[PDB]
Amino acid sequence: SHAVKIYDTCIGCTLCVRACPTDVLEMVPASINAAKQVASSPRVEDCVGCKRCETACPTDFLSIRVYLQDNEETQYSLGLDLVDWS
Amino acid sequence: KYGDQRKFAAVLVPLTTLVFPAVAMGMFVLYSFQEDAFWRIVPGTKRARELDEAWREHPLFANSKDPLDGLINPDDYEKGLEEAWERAKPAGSTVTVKDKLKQLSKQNNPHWESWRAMS
Amino acid sequence: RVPGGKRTQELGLVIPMADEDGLTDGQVAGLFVIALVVFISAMDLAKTMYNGINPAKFKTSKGKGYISPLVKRYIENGF
Amino acid sequence: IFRYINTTLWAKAGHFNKALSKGAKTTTWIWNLHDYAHDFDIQQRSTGLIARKVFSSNLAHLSLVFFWISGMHLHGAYLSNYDIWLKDPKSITPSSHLAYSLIGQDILNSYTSEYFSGITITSGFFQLYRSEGIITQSQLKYACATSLIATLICLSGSYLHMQLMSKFTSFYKKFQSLSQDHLIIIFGSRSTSLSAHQIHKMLPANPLLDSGISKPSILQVISNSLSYTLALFSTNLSSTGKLLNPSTRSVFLSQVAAHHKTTGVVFITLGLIRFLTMYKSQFSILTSYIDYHIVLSINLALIASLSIIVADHLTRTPIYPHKSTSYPTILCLSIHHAWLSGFLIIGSGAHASIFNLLGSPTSEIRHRDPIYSHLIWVCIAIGLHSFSLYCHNDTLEALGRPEDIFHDNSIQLKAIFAKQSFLRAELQPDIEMLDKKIIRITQELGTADFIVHHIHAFTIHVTLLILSKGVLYARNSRFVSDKLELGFTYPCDGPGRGGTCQISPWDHLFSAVFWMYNCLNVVTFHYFWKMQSDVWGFVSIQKHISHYSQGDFSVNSITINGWLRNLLWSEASQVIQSYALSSICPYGFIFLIGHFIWAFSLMFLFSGRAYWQELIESILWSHHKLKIIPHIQPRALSISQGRAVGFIHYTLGGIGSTWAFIISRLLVLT
Amino acid sequence: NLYHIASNANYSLWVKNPIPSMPIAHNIWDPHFTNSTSTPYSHTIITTILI
Amino acid sequence: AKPLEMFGGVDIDLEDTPAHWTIKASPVLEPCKDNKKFHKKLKDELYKVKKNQQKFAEGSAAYARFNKKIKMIELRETAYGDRLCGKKDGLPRTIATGEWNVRGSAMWPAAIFLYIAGWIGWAGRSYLIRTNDAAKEINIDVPLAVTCMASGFSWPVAAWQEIVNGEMAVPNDQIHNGGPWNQS
Amino acid sequence: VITLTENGLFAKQFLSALAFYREGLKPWQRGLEIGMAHGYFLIGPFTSLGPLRNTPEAATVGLLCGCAIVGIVSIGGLIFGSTIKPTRFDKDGDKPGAGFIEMINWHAVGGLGGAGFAHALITVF
Ligand code: CLA
Ligand SMILES: CC1=C(/C=C/C(C)=C/C=C/C(C)=C/C=C/C=C(C)/C=C/C=C(C)/C=C/C2=C(C)CCCC2(C)C)C(C)(C)CCC1
Ligand SMILES: CC1=C(C/C=C(\C)CCC[C@H](C)CCC[C@H](C)CCCC(C)C)C(=O)c2ccccc2C1=O
Ligand code: SF4
Ligand code: SF4
Ligand code: SF4
């Protein structure tokens, strides 16, 4: 599994949530921006690692950062279809 | 004759370039299916857990993984920090040093080293 | 031998071969004994490196360890 | 109507695409502007504009081709030694191409005739002119004039159709009308027109030249007025192709005229048949393939296949007079059409992928795994078999065991079906020769021919694997389940799932171009070595044949070292030792430049754009230091553009290397 | 390297006439060569050598 | 003691005088007009071109063009006579010692190129400074562009006057230094 | 997705009647049948077009090479059965993978037998 971290610079775009193809991200209420909402990654075990969330993030440097961990890959982080690891 | 060393070659060359390599490949593919396979680079192996716990049992390396290890008298450090924060506390602020540090130590990263659950 | 390359043919460079044996079989066996010793010791070293240091030996292993008197001096001389 | 044809958009670059309307903020904008220039589908406005753009651009390109033809005609009339070539084609190399005496470039022109120095052309235009009964300079003048008039007409038509066609325009969608009129009026009614042209201008002329009257009494006989010669004057019974014309070393032009007449009749009859013939099975294909990209892919594949048939039929089915002996011309005519076949096949695959992404695919995409899997297995089987027979021969020859290799004098793999394929040609049991030069002798196919044909099959199958894998896995895949939303061309989907680089159909074309290039480089080498070794060459009066390569193919082409030594090294002596030699200096220089360009492509092929972006930022620091701020911000090439540039330079450099290598050698030997 | 120079080599002869002579790396024992004739790396019936 | 054999062929000056600091005193080189290899090479050029010329007709245009080429070759032979060439190649050399007063010296081309290259760079920089917009880089303001192009001739003085007066460079704290290498 | 070549009546009954799938066969019988097939076939590629294809024997060499191939693939099968341990041939209440190991051992025996039988036919006839 990868590591998807959300930083304080988030401005509640919701673009990262919409771009995620495996429903890793979600919007949670907060009080650090005018949108009163920040992103969260409660399900990074389903994060394939496509980094579309990073493409969609418009902050100066990404408020959402995906750290690839190749020696950590699970069946969900690899998108295995022909083969089951469970 | 200049030959007569080929008596050694006719045994050694077939041996070390066919029998030994084949045995090595078979032993390697057998080793690949052990629970201990590549325990130093592959996460979540039993031997890695045992080695980490063995290190933690040593009296020198008990509090070795703690990034804050070193404070000889942590009570003195905490008291000094609390005193310094009291003189700089903004107006009627209700945050103390103790709970501030307690909540700054507790983060929410459930998916960190979750591979410590199989072996 | 069938030489190749211009220089070997145009200079007559030849490769002499001893008509004797070189080393007798006894000498080769004498070398192979020590080669086997190296091999056994290397397998043992590979095992030790693979398993690594065992810190928990002080709970089970006998003795009480030892720091050589020079190692103590090197410890307190600095770093 | 035409009041809207305004220049106001000429200054406004990037107007056609709404993604470029934000302005040139970065240098990526320039490359995107060039990339979307001809992508009429994604450009602004309705579908009618797409049709107008496509049709008018077709007309403009047709005008461009006509202009190129006109240039060739004017070069032949005013910058050529076509006169002395007409008088003596067996002693004069064709040349309608001079070089100015600047920077010593004068060394490029070489002796072609006692009164002419220039670059030996290998386009075969002189043989075409002679087969077209063109003798006087006035005829070439009027051919050039007609081609220029056609250029102007097609340019004006392209200009007009951008406003003649409207939102209601529908003539392009009437596929029944297009097929019927095309077939009948062009393939039938123009083939018979060319048959008329030949019967009335070639047979009155080409037999006169072959009759030895190159004088032709000037215009007294050459200018038609020869109705006392009969159409089938010198058919000499026999069968078309069994007996060649002994003078020009080609099929008699009367037989060619009869061929064109009969083919026109056949096409007209097929157009009549199409009123009631076999249908209702290709009907799903009929309804599902009415789109620009699908018909473009179909036409590209068809034209490329026709190009390869032309490549194989222009060499040992000699149609043109005095062309079989002109070995550089034969080589060029084969190899150029081979390369065009490969390129247009690749384009057909690309546009099949584009159609799949824009339109809706057909039934064959649902069992795509068995298809693209048995294709994988067959590619692996014929790669591990065809090539390795070369590796086996190489290893056992290096070991000194020639009796264990795959050769004719060893374990031999007989070309059973080809050896039993004496159906083609079926000529008499001897050869044909014109003047110290072999016209055509039957290629005796042995073991080496078998192995190289299997190499061809393997390379073709791998290129097809890449193309069909790109086409079938365009919409979605087990790897990425929403490839349709990603568009046609994209760098990747991200480093996730292990890594998703080069999943787009565009990247599949990117790999397929490399594999097609590798496929027909072997075809070029097989042809270039086989013809020299076993067909082309001198002769001896005692019926003995001395070929150019002295029969190296059957004894050396069984091993890779044979290809390296007897083809890429021994036969490269002409190009490598071509400095200060008048005719072949540019070929040596272009050999060097092709090596440089091919190696230069590897910088784009092996590297990623992030390193270059960081380097560009480091340089931009120094630029900003001295108050030199490029407001079109410098950005490194996009990933897809980096791959495209690498592929283009790779293929261009390699093609130039082969081009120089073959052409210089054939010019020296001839 | 020292063993193969000692056993499968001609140091005792190369040392005498080094300028035109050629040293031997080691013998060649490869069953893939021709069991008949003689390889270009051997003096007829003698063993196979590498320079 | 024969430095040629001592050093494997190469020869040493063995003399310490300022008069030998010029390139013309080198024993490797020799004036081209009295060098055997120079004569042989240009004679071979003349021979090859003449042999090509005879292959054509006497009254043809190719014959006249080959005569012009022969005249060019002979003019090249007489023009490079004062140029220095090696005593073994015959190919004239280019002097890169800053001599300023020898045939084939690299000082004059260096000066000319540096002037015109500074001119080009100065014109481009002036245009970029006077058009602080991206719209002016894709749609060039041609009058201003040619004005800067003509104005660039005084670059060696204007550029230095900007360097010393603090109008060319910019302090590092006003442009992006680069990627962060630390923070924690 | 059912196709004729895998889900047709003939295809189903042919796959089911293979030695690997045939009902009522003890594991050693499947191994013996598969091994006989492999050993009989594997002799040919060596005794013909082999390194000693023209020698007076030219077949004992092929026999040895075929037996070697059978042994190598049997060793691979033993590796597979000691690593993957398929349990579809084990009878109830047995050491896991025992059926597969028995099948592989009897494949080795059958390969020896088939190779020897092919060699005997070649020499005699
Ligand atoms: C009849 C032929 C034909 C036609 C009409 C089209 C039409 C189209 N193609 Mg296409 N294509 C073709 C053949 C054709 N192609 C072939 C043969 C190939 C295989 C190589 C391709 C591969 C291809 C790809 C991979 C893509 C297209 C795309 C497109 C679309 C936009 C093209 C564009 O804007 O490029 C603008 C034009 C250029 C950028 C031309 C630049 C010059 C080229 C790249 C380099 C050539 C170098 C030159 C030959 C050597 C220089 C000489 C040297 C000495 C200096 C358009 C629908 C693109 C698309 O999005 O489709 C919807 C796309 O991604 N095509
Ligand atoms: C070509 C063809 C095909 C195929 C075929 C095949 C696949 C075949 C195979 C065949 C085979 C593959 C056969 C085999 C056989 C075998 C055998 C017949 C064996 C036998 C053996 C034995 C008898 C043995 C015995 C023994 C044992 C068991 C052990 C001990 C010893 C002994 C020897 C006693 C198809 C149909 C597709 C189509 C076309 C035709
Ligand atoms: C070098 C390189 C660059 C940098 C190269 C760039 C930006 C090319 C643009 C430079 C100029 C604009 C090209 C203009 C033409 C040349 C200046 C001259 C060519 C003709 C000469 C012979 C005169 C990338 O951006 C890149 C991106 C992705 C993969 C690989 C690479 C890559 O390899
Ligand atoms: S895209 Fe970036 S800034 Fe926007 S909500 Fe997601 S993490 Fe926050
Ligand atoms: S990398 Fe892809 S899957 Fe993972 S959180 Fe980002 S968008 Fe979602
Ligand atoms: S390396 Fe390039 S192509 Fe591959 S996943 Fe990363 S960005 Fe995409």
Short mmCIF file of C-alpha atoms in Angstrom, two decimals, chain D residues 401 403-404 411, chain G residues 49-51 53:
data_model
loop_
_atom_site.label_atom_id
_atom_site.label_comp_id
_atom_site.label_asym_id
_atom_site.label_seq_id
_atom_site.Cartn_x
_atom_site.Cartn_y
_atom_site.Cartn_z
CA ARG D 401 31.03 -27.84 -36.94
CA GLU D 403 27.98 -30.14 -40.91
CA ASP D 404 25.56 -29.36 -38.06
CA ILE D 411 20.89 -29.95 -42.66
CA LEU G 49 19.28 -34.31 -36.11
CA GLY G 50 21.37 -34.63 -32.95
CA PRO G 51 25.10 -34.13 -32.40
CA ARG G 53 22.90 -38.36 -35.49
#
